[PDB]
Amino acid sequence: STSVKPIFSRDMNEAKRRVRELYRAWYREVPNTVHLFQLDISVKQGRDKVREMFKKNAHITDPRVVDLLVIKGKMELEETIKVWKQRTHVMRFFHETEAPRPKDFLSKFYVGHDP
Amino acid sequence: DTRPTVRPRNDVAHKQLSAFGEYVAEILPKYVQQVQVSCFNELEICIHPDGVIPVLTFLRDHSNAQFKSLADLTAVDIPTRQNRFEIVYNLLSLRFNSRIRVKTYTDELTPIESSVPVYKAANWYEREIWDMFGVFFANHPDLRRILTDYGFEGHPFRKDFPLSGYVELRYDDEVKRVVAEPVELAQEFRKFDLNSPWEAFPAYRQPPE
Amino acid sequence: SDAPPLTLEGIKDRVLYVLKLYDKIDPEKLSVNSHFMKDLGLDSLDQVEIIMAMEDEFGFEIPDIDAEKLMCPQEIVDYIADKKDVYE
Amino acid sequence: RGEYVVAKLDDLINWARRSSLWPMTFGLACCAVEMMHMAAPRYDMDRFGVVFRASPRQSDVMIVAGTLTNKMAPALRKVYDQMPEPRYVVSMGSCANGGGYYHYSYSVVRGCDRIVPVDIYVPGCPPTAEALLYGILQLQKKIKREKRLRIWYRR
Amino acid sequence: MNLMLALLTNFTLATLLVIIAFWLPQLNVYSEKTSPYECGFDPMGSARLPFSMKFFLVAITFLLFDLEIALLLPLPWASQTANLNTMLTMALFLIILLAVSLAYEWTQKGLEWTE
Ligand SMILES: COC1=C(OC)C(=O)C(C/C=C(\C)CC/C=C(/C)CC/C=C(/C)CC/C=C(/C)CC/C=C(/C)CC/C=C(/C)CC/C=C(/C)CC/C=C(/C)CC/C=C(\C)CCC=C(C)C)=C(C)C1=O
Ligand SMILES: CCCCCCCCCCCC(=O)OC[C@H](COP(=O)(O)OCC[N+](C)(C)C)OC(=O)CCCCCCCCCCC
Ligand code: SF4
C-alpha cells in the first residue's frame, strides 16, 4: 500500500529536473518551429504558448504523473523537430477558428443550458 | 461427438495443455499466479508484471517450449479492476504445433518492461498499446504514437474514451488550413440497450453479492 | 593572443546587460545582488530562461544541477568566473 | 454575333476538358480496388480519355476513393490545392461521402466534403466499377453544360 | 543562313507555345497551390541540401572515356591513308589501352557503387 513502481523519477525534486530540461528544449525549439513551418506568429507568441502549457499542470505533486507528462511532452517535441507535424498540427494550440465562448454566468445563461 | 450442431471436444489436447500448464508453473513459481485451460483448449498463464521477461524468455528458449513466434500482443481495459489494463501475449510454437497465452496487468502509471529484447515483433505492438491505451513500456527502443493523429490527445481504446472523441476536423477558408474544433454530430449516435433481463448461461453464474 | 581577456568587471557588465534585455525585469530595479525570486518577482521558469540567455551570451552549457542554484546576478558572475578560471 | 461565337468557343473548351479527364493516382481504401477494375479491360476507362497520372500538377480530377481519416485530411487538402484549375472532385463510396461504416469514429472525417468541394457523389460500399464509371460520365455531362465564356461575355 | 533560320524557327515556335500557356488560361494563384510537392506532407528540409553521388568514381571515368570518342571518331578518315600498317597498329593500340583501363577499374571494384 502506497509503495509503487516508479517510471523515471523517484521524487518530485528529481522529477522537476526533467520538467526544466524539457522546458529548455521547447524554449530553444520555438524559433526553429516558427521558421520551418512558416508560421505567421512571433517567437514570443510561441514561447508564451509553451509557458501556458507548462503552467497548466503546475499543481501536480505525483512524480509518476509528472514523468508521463514529460514523456508526452518529449513525444510532442520529437514530432515537431522532425516535421512529422504539419502547419495544421502546430496551430491547433492556438484555436484560431474557435469563437470565444462565454465565461460569466449571465453570458452562459443567454446562449444555452450548459453550466 | 455425434451431434451435428455441437462442437466436438478434443480431450487429448486438453490433458496435454493442462499438463504443460503445471510444468510452467513449477518452473516459474516466482511469477505464475494462475493457470487455466478453456473448454476449447487454449492455455492461459497469468503472471505477475515483474515476470514478463523471465516468463517469455523461458517460453521462447526452453527446449520443451520453443515458442519462437509472437502471434499478437494486445491490451484489454477493465475499469472495475484496480489494475484496469490486461496485457495479453499470444505465442506460437512451430516445433510443438501449440499455442499459449500469457497475461499480466498494470494501471495508468505503472510501467511494464518492454519485450523487444525477447521478441522483435513486440516493437510495434507495444507502440500500439501505448498509443491506444496509455500503458508505458520501459526501455522501449522508441515509444510514440503509431495509429493516432499527430498531437492527438487521449487514448481511444480506453472504455471511458467516447466513441466519437472530443475533436473533429474540417477545412477553414479564413486560415487556409485544416482546423480542429469540438465535436458536434448532425445525428447523435443512438445508444441501444440490447441486454436481455434473463440470464443466458447458468454455468457462468457468479455467486450472489 | 591579442583579444582582451575576461575580467570580473567584464563578466558583471555582460550579466547585468542580459538581465536588462529580459522583459519581465524592471531596468531601474535590478541590483547586482537582488534575488530573482524574492526581489524581481520572477518564477521558476523565468529563472530558466535567464540561464539560457547566459549560455547564449557566454557560449557554454550550464547543467540543471548547477543552474538551480544561480538565484541572483552575483551568483551567476561567480559561476561564470569559476568555470572560466577568471581569477582576476 | 458575339454571343454565337462565345457559345461555340465554350462548346470547344468544354469538349476538350471532358474528353481528356486525367484523374490523380489517389486511392485510400477498398473503394480504390473498384477503381482499379474501372481501369481493367472490361470497362477500360482509358477509352473514354480518362488516364491516371500520379502528379497532382498534371491531374484534372480527384477521386476520393476510400475512407478519409483525420491524419490523412491535411494531405488530401494539400494535393487538392496543388491541382491546377479547372479541377473537379469526385467522391466515391460511403466513407468518402459521409463517413459510411465509420461515421461515428474518433478518427474519421464525416465526409470528404468537409475538406474539399465535391462535384459528384458516387454511392455504394463500394460502388461497382460500372457505378463509378456512371459518375465519371455524369461529371462529363456537368462539364458539357458549363457557361464560363457566356457568363464572361455579359459581365 | 538556312541552319540559323531553322534554329530560330524551332526555338521561336517553342517560345510562342510557352507564352500562350501562361497568358491564355485563367489563373487562380495562392500560397498552398505553389508549395513544393512531397506526396501531400510538407517537405522535411530543403531540396538544395547535398545529395550524395554513389557513382562518383564512374562519373570521373566517364570524363576520361568520353575523350576516347574524340580520338576514335577520326578513324574512318584515318583508314584512307597510305600508311595502313602504322594506322591500324595505333588504332588497335589506342582501343586496347582504352580496354585495359576498363579492365583495371572493373577488377579493382571501381565500377561498384559505394554503399
Ligand atoms: C490493393 O491495395 C491497394 C493498392 O495496391 C495496388 C493501391 O495502390 C492503393 C492506392 C490506389 C491508387 C493510388 C489508384 C490505383 C488505380 C489504378 C487504375 C492503378 C491500377 C493499374 C494500372 C495499370 C492503371 C493505369 C496505369 C498504367 C501504367 C496503364 C498504361 C496505359 C496508359 C494509357 C498510361 C499512360 C500511357 C501512355 C502511352 C501516355 C498517355 C498519357 C497522356 C498524358 C496522354 C497524351 C499526352 C499529351 C501530353 C497530349 C498529346 C498531344 C500534345 C502534347 C500536343 C501535340 C499536338 C500539337 C498540335 C501541339 C490502394 C488504396 C490499395 O488498397
Ligand atoms: C497578342 C495580343 C493579344 C490581344 C488580346 C487577345 C485576347 C482578348 C481578345 C478579346 C477581344 C474582344 O473584345 O472580344 C470580346 C467581344 C465582345 O466585347 P464586349 O462584350 O464589349 O467585351 C467587354 C467585356 N465583357 C465581355 C466582360 C463585358 O466578343 C467577341 O465578339 C468575341 C469574343 C471571343 C474571342 C473571339 C476570337 C476567336 C478566336 C478563335 C481561336 C481558335
Ligand atoms: S465506402 Fe465501403 S468499400 Fe469504400 S472504403 Fe468505405 S468501407 Fe471500403
D110 touches chain B (CB under 8 A): yes
Nearest residue, CB atoms, C45 vs list A17, A28, A51: A51
The three cell numbers locating residue E36: 513544393
Asked how this structure was determined, the answer is cryo-EM
Distance of CA D56 to the CA centre of its chain: 13
Nearest CA to ligand 3 atom 2: D125
Strands B112-113 and B137-138: parallel
Rounded to whole angstroms, the Cα distance separating B108 from D56 reads 45
Residue corresponding to grid cell 520443451 = B64
Residue D32 and residue D93: Cα distance in Å, rounded?
A: 10
Ligand 1, atom 40, lies closest to the CA of: D51
E neighbours by CB contacts (3+ pairs under 8 Å): A, B, D
Write A21-26 long-range contacts (CB < 8 A, 24+): A21/C64, A22/A70, A22/A73, A22/A74, A22/A77, A23/A50, A23/A54, A23/C45, A23/C48, A24/C48, A24/C52, A25/A74, A25/A77, A26/A50, A26/A73, A26/A77
The reply to whether C43 belongs to the active site is yes
Residue B98, beta-bridge partner list: B93
Whose cell is 454511392? That residue is D123
CA of D37 relative to ligand 3 center, distance in Å: 15
Q: Is D103 in the pocket of ligand 3 (CB under 6 A)?
A: no
Tell me, yes or no, whether E2 lies in a domain.
no
Q: How far is D79 from chain E (nearest CA, A)?
A: 5
Whether E112 maps to a domain, the answer reads no
Cα(E28)–Cα(D80) distance, integer angstroms: 14
CA dihedral for E45, E49, E50, E51, sign (positive or negative): positive
Q: At what angle do helices C44-58 and C8-21 cross, to 10 degrees?
A: 130
Helix axis angle, D129-144 relative to D31-39, nearest 10°?
70
Range of the domain at E49: 7-107
B117 reaches D (C-beta below 8 A): no
Provide the domain count of chain E: 1
**Residues written for chain E:** 115
Report the phi/psi class of residue C63: left, alpha or beta, with left for phi > 0 and alpha for psi in -120 to 50.
Answer: beta
B198: cell is: 434473463
Does D112 count as an annotated binding residue?
Answer: no
Ligand 2 center–CA E21 separation, angstroms: 18
How far apart CA D16 and CA D10 sit, in angstroms, is 10
Three-state SS for D40-104 is CCCCCHHHHCCCCECCHHHCCEEEEECCCECCCHHHHHHHHHCCCCCCEEEEEHHHHHHCHHHCC
A86/E41 CB distance under 8 A:
yes
Nearest CA in chain B to D104: B164
Residue D125 annotated in ligand binding: yes
Q: What share of chain D is helix, strand, coil (3-state, %, to 5)?
A: 50, 10, 40
DSSP C28-69: GG--TT--TTTTT---HHHHHHHHHHHHHHHTS---HHHHTT
CATH of the domain at E99: 1.20.58.1610
Among all bound ligands, the one having the nearest atom to the CA of D150 is: 2
Q: How far apart are CA A24 and CA C49, in angstroms?
A: 8
Q: What are phi and psi of B135, to 5 degrees?
A: -100, 120
| D150 phi, psi to nearest 5 deg | -60, -40
- Asked if D63 contacts D24 with a C-beta cutoff of 8 angstroms, the reply is yes
In a domain, E69, yes or no: yes
- Minimal Cα–Cα distance from E31 to chain B, Å? 9
For ligand 2, the distance from its centroid to the CA atom of residue E24, given in whole angstroms, is 12
- A72 close to A18: Cβ distance less than 8 angstroms: no
Residue nearest to atom 6 of ligand 3 (CA): D95
The ranges assigned to domains in chain A are 1-115
Tell whether omega for the bond before D126 is within 30 degrees of 0, i.e. cis: yes
Tell me the chain E residues in contact with residue B176 when contact means C-beta distances shorter than 8 Å: 30-32
Q: Which DSSP helix (H) or strand (E) runs through A22? A: helix A12-36
Minimal CA separation from A71 to chain D, in Å: 22
Nearest CA to ligand 3 atom 8: D30
Backbone φ, ψ for residue B168 (5° rounding): -145, 160
Residues with CB under 6 A from ligand 1: D 25-29, 32-33, 35-36, 39, 46, 51-52, 66
Please give the backbone phi and psi of residue B138, each rounded to the nearest 5 degrees, phi first.
Answer: -75, 145
